[PDB]
Ligand binder design. Structure first.
Ligand code: GTP
Ligand code: ACP
Ligand code: GDP
Ligand code: NSJ
Ligand code: NSJ
Ligand code: CA
Ligand code: CA
Ligand code: CA
Ligand code: MG
Ligand code: MG
Ligand code: MG
Lengths: 438, 54, 426, 346
């Protein structure tokens, strides 16, 4: 058994982390007080779920998580919420005032003063791990903390834990659920300095989660709670292999090995299905073929783009529920005959498949309907470059007038970092086109 | 349409299906970066207080 | 715990400040004796942003009342909620400022500024984490204008990294007390361009026109104009005083509303403005709020372009319908929104409507149309200054002509900076 | 009130559509860089499809289908027809073609020679045409040397040595059909087509003078010496062409040719529908196409190419451009039939 430490940075990371650990507990039969009746080894054990939970002598199963935010109002919800008992206070770190959506402020001004503390707390978790695999870092692109402090943390992690994998769950900025105007700046600044430090990053576009919540769940105006429960379903699908007995994606290094041929191109596309409204009278349970075909519909993608006009480098199907290999290969064969799935000429046209028999768990009273089988497809497509183009274009419009630049310079950043970061994104866009276009 | 590496356990199974074969900055350097930015913030503040003292 | 220290200076500053505390004290359930008698936890959620808590569950506004003559602050102390203010936070002189910027900024005001800062320091020393400061004042008089901007300058020196916010009443010959108002305003705008982070421009002419033409007030009074200011101030601070999926502290507002440091002057708008029991649908709120006749800057937004817009809707209404209406206003008047700041129109919703209203909408715009307000001032200023009219009131206080020339050049530069981005394209 | 941007100032077609849109008093044109638009009249090259359909509250529509180039590229079309099971290499309406890359750079060089030798040995007509600057030759040695002297990809296809010649004049011609595909992927055929006729007598014993073989409107009005003799501007419309078919062949344009044209259009467009459809997409596409056909002396219709940015016949701009606004734009942005629907299974 090898441990995984989750790091939640900023409001989005923290609130998503809260929704994931709530789900993890329901999935492993852990009560809010930390007790786990099914766990027969008290105060220890090297089971699969122990990759994410430690154990006290009193039988409490404590998440291997660190929550960090430069302002206390969001983490104070964890300190007094339903699961206030799961984490001990040392795991919840909060500053006094946030980065005001200013990358430079979270990276330079405020990050400089709290970085060593966060490292100390993380070192306390590492010392409890007999074989630490790596870190899972949750954060937004647009926030001043999620962008600025994360990139600083990722730099230090590569120093203190050189031989450790680092995975990201990054929230891509969407205007429909954001009141910030400078997020294109923060997104490009954080991607530039974090790129060489991240081994695999799963971008979730809030625009996609918002549309799925309006379209499938019939929520006229979804909230962050609605968005976070759906997001945690996908995170759970992606991390289930580390927490349950299995043979696919068993350690963090496998995500890079199966999904990232080239280090810079480490942004796989995530697709999840089915999302069914719980308020629905009663849905007709979808089949393996139907949910598998849905993985190739843009409407179920975590980032809206057209994979038909990119090229695939790898493709992973992660099923949960009543699924047998027979139905998967049969549905796959049919999809190849109907879909535009073009792989690069230097990669095998194949799919890695994982099945976990335990069906998706849903939070009681939540928006998601209980389904008998679900699937999350992780594919590395050049089509996800569309997201970099969109973002880079918004960056160009504001930077051509130097709009808002003074806020970053005022915090100690040099204007040259904008152009250096932008030129790195221009090169990243070029790499995606060198692989996908003819 | 081939299957390989079929693994089975009590909580699920995993396999591979092939359809067609193919054809850092050191700790010191980070300190300099941070402290350099802190210095430029000190310079700008100094010019404000200098401006205000005048 | 993101506390704000409020300062109100001069006659206009204290009259508008008093009504503002009267309005929000009602919204938060605070009575005139500091006792909370509300019915919702949302009222006490962010109560510490503007109110200090004393013994006996009393809530005392974190407000400093400043003036160079006692007259106005005596009216406040004897007004509706006069008892609510901390007795130690009344800082006043006797000489007065004679509607003279130089007296408030240099002579009479310097003699009193240190004790105001002593009270400011006392309030800041007790804040868990100070957001910043907000000042209410006029620009056409002497105390709020001249001493007001002096206080800002000294607050900058002692708290250089805190946000400095002002509600600034711009003079107008139509609602004028003295002919020297353009002098006092031009000198203040110079201080504001350099030392404030966000200034909400409140034009007394717009306040007058709205009372006369829209509200149908035959003979408006200063009290009538201040009702609009109270309402507007309550609106622009809604997302600081109540919980919501917005958070928003002063610095995060500035970061997203100010693309360039000099251009931090905002035009506020409010709706409804009815002369009354009728229910106002969301489209009615959005059409009215964005209409010129609903704006306090006496500037026609169609004469310029919005750099950024922030709007708040208060009341129980269709949050989906709100997005549909805001998105409809931009996508149907795209010529008046700059296209090189993606998604520069942002909207927030709050469930608590203002007193006596099912719902309302307040909005602030960083529009290049504001340049017309500064052009008007600059015109009146130069008309008098070219003949050196009334200057002896100022040179008699130690000021030199060169200081007027500098303030004029800087304000005229500001106009050119607005005109530069009004023509900018992608 | 709808808004649109123009990003191809050289499109005669959508210039008229732009001039019509503004005429309805219900459409507002923005700067080409303003992203808050409902309709994009996009650029021919490198159209940024990746930025469409991400504006909150804006339903956005574009006049190009992402991926239609697979059809409107000489080499792409040859590969599509040979590798698509819906079309197969046995497709009976597309001349035998081969993709040939210049030697200074897969490639079908040898495969082309195998078929050529078969024709030379069997006494059969063995003339081919190369294009990407066009060359017609009956000797294989010449066609290949022409592609190597260039630097871009070329295709070599069989030259129709038995074209249908109009009389009097004994002259060649081609048929242009305009086809509009809307966001629902309905395939509409403009009821009006044009024949671009050769003003010179067809001479099968000399491919050196390419004025009686190339019926392009540009090659006829510049190098031909009988321009505008038989028909104004070397353009004959269906009404006249149909009456000619009745007088000479005792047949009709519909039976003799138009059925085949409709079949070819459906076959090509249905083939790529899974790849380019915007049905389940965050933005919507439509596009006007120009299909170029050849008719042989057996009244068999051959597909020559498909133009993705076609112009129109001057006499037909008004009606067609109004038809684009009616079915393509107003269908998505309603305000306050000249087409033939080629029904199919979506
Ligand atoms: N999906 C999702 N997105 C969120 C959530 N909270 C914030 N965001 C997004 O994150 C972006 C804003 O960044 P934040 O995470 O709120 O800022 P931060 O990381 O706390 O850093 P600060 O600027 O210091 O507050 C916007 O695009 C929001 O839409 C959340 O709970 N779920
Ligand atoms: N295989 C073939 N047999 C007979 N004629 C042919 C032919 N291929 C091309 N042509 C002649 O060439 C002309 C069309 O050329 P082509 O369309 O390939 O060039 P082009 O694309 O630059 C002109 P456009 O796109 O405007 O139709 C037709 O008029 C036709 O007469
Ligand atoms: N809206 C409003 N404007 C005022 C009020 N009192 C004064 N003014 C305006 O403010 C200017 C006079 O400044 P004043 O505040 O009286 O001077 P001070 O007391 O020395 O600061 C003139 O432009 C007046 O029209 C008021 O109560 N409300
Ligand atoms: O004119 C100025 C030059 C520098 C700084 C400032 C103060 N402030 C303006 C709002 S943005 C944050 C900075 C004004
Ligand atoms: O930055 C923001 C974006 C949307 C809304 C708000 C809240 N508020 C600010 C004062 S004016 C009314 C609107 C802030
Ligand atoms: Ca155990
Ligand atoms: Ca590393
Ligand atoms: Ca004195
Ligand atoms: Mg935050
Ligand atoms: Mg007065
Ligand atoms: Mg062509």
């Amino acid at each position: 058994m090898r441990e995984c430490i989750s790091i939640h940075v900023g409001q989005a990371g923290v609130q998503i982390g809260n929704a994931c650990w709530e789900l993890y507990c329901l999935e492993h039969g852990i009560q809010p007080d930390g007790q786990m009746p099914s766990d027969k080894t008290i105060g220890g054990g090297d089971d699969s779920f122990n990759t994410f939970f430690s154990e006290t002598g009193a039988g409490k199963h404590v998440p291997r998580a660190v929550f960090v935010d430069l302002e206390p109002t969001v983490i104070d919800e964890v300190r007094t919420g339903t699961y206030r008992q799961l984490f001990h206070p040392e795991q919840l770190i909060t500053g006094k005032e946030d980065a005001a959506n200013n990358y430079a402020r979270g990276h330079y001004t405020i990050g400089k003063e709290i970085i060593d503390l966060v490292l100390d707390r993380i070192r306390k978790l590492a010392d409890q791990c007999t074989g630490l695999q790596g870190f899972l870092v949750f954060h937004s692109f647009g926030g001043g903390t999620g962008s600025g402090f994360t990139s600083l943390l990722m730099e230090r992690l590569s120093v203190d834990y050189g031989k450790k994998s680092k995975l990201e769950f990054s929230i891509y900025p969407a205007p429909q659920v954001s009141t910030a105007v400078v997020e294109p700046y923060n997104s490009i600044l954080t991607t530039h300095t974090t790129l060489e430090h991240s081994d695999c990053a799963f971008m979730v576009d809030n625009e996609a989660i918002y549309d799925i919540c309006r379209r499938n769940l019939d929520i006229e105006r979804p909230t962050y709670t609605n968005l976070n429960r759906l997001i945690s379903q996908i995170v759970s699908s992606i991390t289930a292999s580390l927490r349950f007995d299995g043979a696919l994606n068993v350690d963090l290094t496998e995500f890079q090995t199966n999904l990232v041929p080239y280090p810079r191109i480490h942004f796989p596309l995530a697709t999840y299905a089915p999302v069914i409204s719980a308020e629905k009278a009663y849905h007709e349970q979808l089949s393996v073929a139907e949910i598998t075909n849905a993985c190739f519909e843009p409407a179920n993608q975590m980032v809206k783009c057209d994979p038909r006009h990119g090229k695939y480098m790898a493709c992973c199907l992660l099923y949960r529920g009543d699924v047998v290999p027979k139905d998967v290969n049969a549905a796959i064969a049919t999809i190849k005959t109907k879909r535009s799935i073009q792989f690069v000429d230097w990669c095998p046209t194949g799919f890695k498949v994982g099945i976990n028999y335990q069906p998706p768990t849903v939070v009681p009273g939540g928006d998601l309907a209980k389904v008998q089988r679900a699937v999350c497809m992780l594919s590395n497509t050049t089509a996800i470059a569309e997201a970099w183009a969109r973002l880079d274009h918004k960056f160009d419009l504001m930077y051509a007038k130097r709009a808002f630049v003074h806020w970053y310079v005022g915090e100690g950043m040099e204007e040259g970092e904008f152009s250096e970061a932008r030129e790195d994104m221009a090169a990243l866009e070029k790499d995606y086109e060198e692989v996908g276009v003819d | 349409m081939e299957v390989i590496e079929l693994n089975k356990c009590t909580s699920g199974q995993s396999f591979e299906v092939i359809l067609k074969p193919p054809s850092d900055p050191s700790l010191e350097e980070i300190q300099k970066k941070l402290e350099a930015a802190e210095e430029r913030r000190k310079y700008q503040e100094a010019e404000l207080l200098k401006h205000l003292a005048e | 715990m993101r506390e704000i220290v409020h300062i109100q200076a001069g006659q206009c500053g204290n009259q508008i400040g008093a009504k503002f505390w009267e309005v929000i004290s009602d919204e938060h359930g605070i009575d005139p004796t500091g006792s909370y008698h509300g019915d919702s936890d949302l009222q006490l959620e962010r109560i510490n942003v503007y109110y200090n808590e004393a013994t006996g569950n009393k809530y005392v506004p974190r407000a400093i009342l400043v003036d160079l003559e006692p007259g106005t602050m005596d009216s406040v102390r004897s007004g509706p909620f006069g008892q609510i203010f901390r007795p130690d936070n009344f800082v006043f002189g006797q000489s007065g400022a004679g509607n003279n910027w130089a007296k408030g900024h240099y002579t009479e005001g310097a003699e009193l500024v240190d004790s105001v800062l002593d009270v400011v320091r006392k309030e800041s020393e007790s804040c868990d984490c100070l957001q910043g400061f907000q000042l209410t004042h006029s620009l056409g008089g002497g105390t709020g204008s001249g001493m007001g901007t002096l206080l800002i300058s000294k607050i900058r020196e002692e708290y250089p990294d805190r946000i400095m916010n002002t509600f600034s009443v711009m003079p107008s010959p139509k609602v004028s007390d003295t002919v020297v108002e353009p002098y006092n305003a031009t000198l203040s705008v110079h201080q504001l361009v350099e030392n404030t982070d966000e200034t909400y421009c409140i034009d007394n002419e717009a306040l007058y026109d709205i009372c006369f033409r829209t509200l149908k007030l035959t003979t408006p009074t200063y009290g009538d104009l201040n009702h609009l200011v109270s309402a507007t101030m309550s609106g622009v601070t809604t997302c600081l005083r109540f919980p919501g999926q917005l958070n928003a502290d002063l610095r995060k507002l500035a970061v997203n509303m100010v693309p360039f440091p000099r251009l931090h002057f905002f035009m506020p708008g409010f709706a409804p403005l009815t002369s009354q029991y009728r229910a106002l649908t969301v489209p009615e709120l959005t059409q009215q709020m964005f209409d010129s006749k609903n704006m306090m800057a006496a500037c026609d937004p169609r004469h310029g372009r919005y750099l950024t817009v922030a709007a708040i809707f208060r009341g129980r209404m269709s949050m989906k319908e709100v997005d549909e209406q805001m998105l409809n206003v931009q996508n149907k008047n795209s010529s008046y929104f700059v296209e090189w700041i993606p998604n520069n129109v942002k909207t927030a919703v709050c469930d608590i409507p203002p007193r006596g209203l099912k719902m309302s909408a307040t909005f602030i715009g960083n529009s290049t149309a504001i340049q017309e307000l500064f052009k008007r001032i600059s015109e009146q200023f130069t008309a008098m200054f070219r003949r050196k009219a009334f200057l002896h009131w100022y040179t008699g206080e130690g000021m030199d002509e060169m200081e007027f020339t500098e303030a004029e050049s800087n304000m005229n530069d500001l106009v050119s900076e607005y005109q530069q981005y009004q023509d900018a394209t992608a | 009130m709808y808004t649109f941007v123009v990003r191809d100032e050289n499109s005669s077609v959508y210039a008229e559509v732009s001039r019509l849109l503004l005429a309805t008093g219900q459409w507002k044109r923005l700067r080409k860089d303003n992203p808050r638009f409902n309709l994009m009249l996009g650029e021919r090259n490198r159209l940024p499809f990746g930025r469409l359909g991400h504006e909150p509250g804006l339903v956005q529509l574009v006049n190009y289908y992402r991926g239609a180039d697979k059809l409107c590229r000489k080499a792409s079309l040859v590969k599509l027809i040979k590798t698509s099971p819906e079309l197969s290499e046995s497709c009976t309406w597309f001349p035998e073609s081969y993709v040939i890359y210049p030697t200074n750079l897969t490639d079908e060089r040898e495969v082309f020679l195998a078929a050529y030798n078969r024709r030379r040995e069997g006494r059969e007509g063995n003339v081919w045409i190369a294009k990407s600057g066009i060359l017609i030759s009956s000797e294989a040695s010449e066609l290949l040397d022409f592609i190597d002297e260039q630097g871009q990809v070329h295709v070599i296809q069989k030259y129709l040595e038995k074209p249908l010649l109009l009389e009097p004049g004994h002259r060649k011609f081609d048929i242009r059909s305009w086809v509009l595909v809307d966001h629902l992927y309905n395939i509409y055929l403009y009821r009006e087509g044009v024949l671009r006729t050769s003003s010179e007598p067809y001479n099968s014993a000399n491919f050196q003078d390419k004025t009686c073989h190339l019926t392009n409107h540009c090659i006829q009005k510049e190098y031909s010496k009988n321009y505008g003799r038989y028909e104004e501007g070397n353009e004959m419309f269906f009404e006249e062409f149909n009456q000619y078919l009745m007088d000479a062949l005792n047949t009709t344009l519909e039976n003799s040719i138009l059925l085949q044209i409709k079949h070819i259009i459906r076959s090509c467009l249905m083939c790529i529908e899974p790849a380019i459809s915007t049905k389940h997409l965050h933005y919507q596409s439509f596009q006007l196409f120009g299909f170029d056909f050849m008719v042989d002396e057996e009244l068999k219709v051959w597909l020559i190419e498909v133009n993705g940015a076609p112009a129109c016949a001057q006499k037909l701009y008004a009606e067609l451009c109004q038809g684009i606004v009616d079915v393509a734009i107003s269908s998505v942005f309603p305000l306050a039939s000249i087409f033939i629907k080629l029904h199919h299974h979506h």
